[PDB]
Amino acid sequence: DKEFQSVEEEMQSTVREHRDGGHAGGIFNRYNILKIQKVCNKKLWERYTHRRKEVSEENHNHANERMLFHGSPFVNAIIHKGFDERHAYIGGMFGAGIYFAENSSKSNQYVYGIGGGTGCPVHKDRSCYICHRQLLFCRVTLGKSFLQFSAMKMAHSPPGHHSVTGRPSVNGLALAEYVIYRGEQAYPEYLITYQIMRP
Numbered sequence: 001d002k003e004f005q006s007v008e009e010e011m012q013s014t015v016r017e018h019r020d021g022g023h024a025g026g027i028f029n030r031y032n033i034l035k036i037q038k039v040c041n042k043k044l045w046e047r048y049t050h051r052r053k054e055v056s057e058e059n060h061n062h063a064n065e066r067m068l069f070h071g072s073p074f075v076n077a078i079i080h081k082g083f084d085e086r087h088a089y090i091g092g093m094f095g096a097g098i099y100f101a102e103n104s105s106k107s108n109q110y111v112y113g114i115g116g117g118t119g120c121p122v123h124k125d126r127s128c129y130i131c132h133r134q135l136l137f138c139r140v141t142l143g144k145s146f147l148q149f150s151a152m153k154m155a156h157s158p159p160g161h162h163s164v165t166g167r168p169s170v171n172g173l174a175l176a177e178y179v180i181y182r183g184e185q186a187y188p189e190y191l192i193t194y195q196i197m198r199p
């Protein structure tokens with residue numbers, strides 16, 4: 001209903017023009033939203049809320065929950081098993097965490113692998129306008145989030161913190177990114193099936 005409409009609006013309005021000129025994610029200004037499904041995995045939801053309650057107790061009764069995008073070739077494993085820090089992006093700017101973006105076009109750069117990988121499996125095109133892509137729109141508990149501008153290779157959250165917020169800087173980050181170090185600190189709420197569209 002209006003629930004899915006607000007997801008599509010969030011998806012469309014957070015697109016940015018990327019500095020790599022579309023190298024990783026493709027050349028587009030909008031998507032063709034094909035499908036939006038709400039993921040209902042009861043064991044995952046309980047694992048997520050149990051940790052959410054715990055983080056709230058450690059952050060002045062505030063979870064600091066945000067709706068953030070995740071792009072990955074492992075969407076199906078995430079949907080069934082949940083996010084898993086044992087599969088963290090080690091090559092990441094903030095070390096061994098699970099990365100999220102508030103810009104859908106940033107998470108779109110990661111759907112086929114790091115830097116878009118080799119693109120779609122059928123045409124090997126990072127800018128494929130034919131193949132259907134999937135992105136997750138997630139509930140992410142940031143708790144007490146550590147604000148950082150430069151690269152900091154963490155294995156875990158910094159002491160007394162529950163996440164890292166990568167803020168844009170000149171050297172530096174173009175857009176924000178959010179890093180959790182425990183899989184249970186995110187729930188894959190919505191599965192968005194989409195195509196990027198030729199401008």
Ligand SMILES: NC(=O)c1ccc(I)c([N+](=O)[O-])c1
Nearest residue numbers: 038039040041042043045189
């Ligand atoms: N997707 C959700 O926000 C959500 C809310 C409540 C539940 I009980 C579940 N669930 O996956 O079982 C999901």
Ligand SMILES: NC(=O)c1ccc(I)c([N+](=O)[O-])c1
Nearest residue numbers: 074077078081082083084087
């Ligand atoms: N790399 C993998 O085989 C893999 C398995 C499970 C997961 I939850 C992930 N993951 O990075 O989302 C990756």
Ligand SMILES: NC(=O)c1ccc(I)c([N+](=O)[O-])c1
Nearest residue numbers: 070071072089099100101107
């Ligand atoms: N490991 C991933 O799939 C991944 C890595 C970095 C990022 I910035 C994202 N992301 O969706 O924002 C995902």
Ligand SMILES: [Zn+2]
Nearest residue numbers: 120123128131
């Ligand atoms: Zn393709």
